């Protein structure tokens, strides 16, 4: 089953702005998760061809990954922190929906999510 185009990271018709929270999401949150030992599966879109998961896009209708998020942050795609936090949450929940509890990929997602929650609890107030 072929992979879809990845989620867009540019769109001149979409509104965007810089906020101190979005800066924090890039410089602190993404940076911290990206370097984790278990980050590598989440640094690019799921490749359902390489992994022989022909049902992946029958089950996961909103794919998301940190490569995409990183590009969205670096390219000033977002309007607010909520848009970016939603992408992270979609990434994690996709993994929990598709896989069995306790599978390695779920444990890896859970480790990143634990760090994510700590950093989101520490989200700065809007300037
Ligand atoms: O929900 C997911 C489910 C699964 N799998 C099902 C269980 O068996 C391992 C693959 O994998 C992933 C992966 C992932 C795991 C292992 C290798 C690779 C990926 S994504 C990718 C892209 C290019 C090359 C290799 C890999 C990442 C995020 C979510 C899932
Ligand atoms: Cl497909
Ligand atoms: Cl493909
Ligand atoms: Cl470690």
UniProtKB/Swiss-Prot annotation:
Post-translational modification: Phosphorylation by CK2 disrupt the intramolecular binding between the bromo domain 2 and the NPS region and promotes binding between the NPS and the BID regions, leading to activate the protein and promote binding to acetylated histones. In absence of phosphorylation, BRD4 does not localize to p53/TP53 target gene promoters, phosphorylation promoting recruitment to p53/TP53 target promoters.
Ranges in a coiled coil: none
Covalent crosslink: Glycyl lysine isopeptide (Lys-Gly) (interchain with G-Cter in SUMO2): 58
Annotated localization: Nucleus; Chromosome
Tissue occurrence: Ubiquitously expressed.
Positions bearing the site annotation: Acetylated histone binding: 99
Bromo domain: residues covered: 17-123
Superkingdom in the source lineage: Eukaryota
Misc remark: JQ1, a thieno-triazolo-1,4-diazepine derivative, and I-BET, a benzodiazepine derivative, have been tested on tumors with success. Treatment with GSK1210151A (I-BET151, a I-BET derivative) has strong effets on mixed lineage leukemia and promotes myeloid differentiation and leukemia stem-cell depletion.
Disease: Cornelia de Lange syndrome 6: A form of Cornelia de Lange syndrome, a clinically heterogeneous developmental disorder associated with malformations affecting multiple systems. It is characterized by facial dysmorphisms, abnormal hands and feet, growth delay, cognitive retardation, hirsutism, gastroesophageal dysfunction and cardiac, ophthalmologic and genitourinary anomalies. CDLS6 inheritance is autosomal dominant.
Quaternary structure annotation from Swiss-Prot or TrEMBL: Interacts with p53/TP53; the interaction is direct. Interacts (via CTD region) with CDK9 and CCNT1, acting as an associated component of P-TEFb complex. Interacts with RELA (when acetylated at 'Lys-310'). Interacts (via NET domain) with NSD3, CHD4, BICRA and ATAD5. The interaction with BICRA bridges BRD4 to the GBAF complex. Interacts (via NET domain) with JMJD6 (via JmjC and N-terminal domains); the interaction is stronger in presence of ssRNA and recruits JMJD6 on distal enhancers. Interacts with NSD3. Interacts with NIPBL. (Microbial infection) Interacts with bovine papillomavirus type 1 regulatory protein E2. This interactions may serve for the tethering of viral genomes to host mitotic chromosomes allowing successful partitioning of the viral genome during cell division.
Record text about domains: The NET domain mediates interaction with a number of chromatin proteins involved in transcription regulation (NSD3, JMJD6, CHD4, GLTSCR1 and ATAD5). The C-terminal (CTD) region mediates interaction and recruitment of CDK9 and CCNT1 subunits of the P-TEFb complex. It is also required for maintenance of higher-order chromatin structure.
Recorded family membership: Belongs to the BET family.
Function: Chromatin reader protein that recognizes and binds acetylated histones and plays a key role in transmission of epigenetic memory across cell divisions and transcription regulation. Remains associated with acetylated chromatin throughout the entire cell cycle and provides epigenetic memory for postmitotic G1 gene transcription by preserving acetylated chromatin status and maintaining high-order chromatin structure. During interphase, plays a key role in regulating the transcription of signal-inducible genes by associating with the P-TEFb complex and recruiting it to promoters.
Protein name in the entry: Bromodomain-containing protein 4
Organism: Homo sapiens
Gene coding for it: BRD4
Portion of the parent chain present: 44 to 168 of 1362
């Amino acid at each position: 089953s072929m992979n879809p185009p990845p989620p867009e990271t540019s769109n001149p018709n979409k509104p965007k702005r810089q906020t101190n929270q979005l800066q924090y999401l890039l410089r602190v949150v993404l940076k911290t998760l990206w370097k984790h030992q278990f980050a590598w599966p989440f640094q690019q879109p799921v490749d359902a061809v390489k992994l022989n998961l022909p049902d992946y896009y029958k089950i996961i209708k909103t794919p998301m990954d940190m490569g995409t998020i990183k590009k969205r942050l670096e390219n000033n795609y977002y309007w607010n922190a909520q848009e970016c936090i939603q992408d992270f949450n979609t990434m994690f929940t996709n993994c929990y929906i598709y896989n069995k509890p306790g599978d390695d990929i779920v444990l890896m997602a859970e480790a990143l999510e634990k760090l994510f929650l700590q950093k989101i609890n520490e989200l700065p107030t809007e300037e």
